[PDB]
């Protein structure tokens, strides 16, 4: 009993889409987050994924192509035009994700305001004291999660976030170490994303579902003699 996926039977030998669903031999299919598109037809040039005025995962098999829609994108209308053939007809499939302004739950330490990304919190590190260490806290407490957590650091980051993260602060005199985010939040499906706007590096990760236990971690951002750190806290149950 599956759902979400879309199947395009355009050959001979689950929402089913066929020739009837085309308009003037065009299929303006609008994919959603974590939605798997499937087609079964002999493509013209054995290839599709391009620009037409971004494929995370595409598997090309004989007379069959599987595509999973990505979870984060900033392009308004980034499309893919699978041009196929069946019988004596030529059909084209235009895939495009639903435009949604996903707001990154994190701290923008940079000062540029013409960024392609939107952060819930922000702290211009360039204004911070030299030889200082200011915090920018971030918290989450939803039953189910579908969020993007990251930061925009104009300088070096510590550690490699968010594949590696920094353990939370100890009340007693105990050390805090660097761990892999996989083990820290104790889930499997962790998407990772990286981007760069000039000197500003921006690294983030996606979380989907409900976490096992309420967990917290930290990521450190330094620029010249100034420094800062973002503390994240996600709640279970």
């Amino acid at each position, epitope marked *: 009993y599956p759902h979400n996926i879309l199947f395009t039977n355009l050959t001979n030998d689950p929402k089913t889409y066929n020739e009837s669903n085309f308009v003037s031999n065009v299929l303006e299919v609008e994919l959603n987050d974590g939605e798997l598109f499937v087609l079964a037809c002999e493509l013209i040039n054995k290839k599709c994924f391009q620009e037409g005025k971004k494929s995370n995962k595409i598997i090309y098999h004989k007379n069959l192509t599987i595509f999973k829609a990505p979870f984060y994108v900033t392009s308004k209308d980034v499309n893919t035009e699978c041009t196929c053939k069946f019988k004596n007809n030529n059909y084209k499939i235009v895939l495009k994700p639903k435009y949604e302004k996903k707001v990154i739950h994190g701290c923008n330490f940079s000062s540029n305001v013409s960024s392609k990304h939107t952060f819930t919190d922000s702290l211009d590190i360039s204004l911070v004291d030299d*030889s*200082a*260490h*200011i*915090s920018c806290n971030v918290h989450l407490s939803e039953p189910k999660y579908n969020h993007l957590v990251g930061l925009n650091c104009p300088g070096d980051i*510590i550690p490699d976030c968010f594949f590696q993260v*920094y353990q939370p*602060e100890s*009340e*007693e*005199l105990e*050390p*805090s170490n660097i761990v892999y985010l996989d083990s820290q939040i104790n889930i499997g499906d962790i998407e990772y994303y990286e981007d760069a706007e000039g000197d500003d590096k921006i690294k983030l990760f996606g979380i989907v579902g409900s976490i096992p236990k309420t967990t917290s971690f*930290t990521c*450190i951002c*330094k620029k010249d003699k100034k*420094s*800062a*750190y973002m503390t994240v806290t996600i709640d279970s149950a």
Partner: nanobody, 120 residues
Framework: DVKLVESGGGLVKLGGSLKLSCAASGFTFSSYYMSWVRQTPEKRLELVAAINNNGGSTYYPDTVKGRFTISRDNAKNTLNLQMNSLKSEDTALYYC?????????????WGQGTTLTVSS
């Protein structure tokens, strides 16, 4: 500029006791982990004692646990270390250094040190 000034070091006879103080200036003393670290004649570095930002919890390695006692007066921007029952092995140059959870407990500032000599 951040500044840490150790003081109070000298010659102590075997088994004696001495208090070393550290003056801090140029930063929010209350937001940083302070620590005393000493350098042996063998030129090795050893953590003597450490304290948290609010002065609540402290740690001492077993080598000096119970003998020495770290303390901090955030109102006066001072860090004190009362060392008791000093042994000859404690002869070292004692540094006053800082850390912050927000810099991965990095010793980014150290004083010039005060020299302790434990001999009869």
């Amino acid at each position: 500029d951040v500044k840490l000034v150790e003081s109070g070091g000298g010659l102590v006879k075997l088994g004696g006791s001495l208090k070393l103080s550290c003056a801090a200036s140029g930063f929010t003393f209350s937001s940083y982990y302070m620590s005393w670290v000493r350098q042996t004649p063998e030129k090795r570095l050893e953590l003597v004692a450490a304290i948290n930002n609010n002065g609540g919890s402290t740690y001492y390695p077993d080598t000096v646990k119970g003998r020495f006692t770290i303390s901090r007066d955030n109102a006066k921007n001072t860090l004190n270390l009362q060392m008791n029952s000093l042994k000859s092995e404690d002869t070292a140059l004692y540094y006053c250094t800082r850390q912050h959870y927000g810099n991965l407990y990095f010793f980014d500032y150290w004083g010039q040190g005060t020299t302790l000599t434990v001999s009869s």
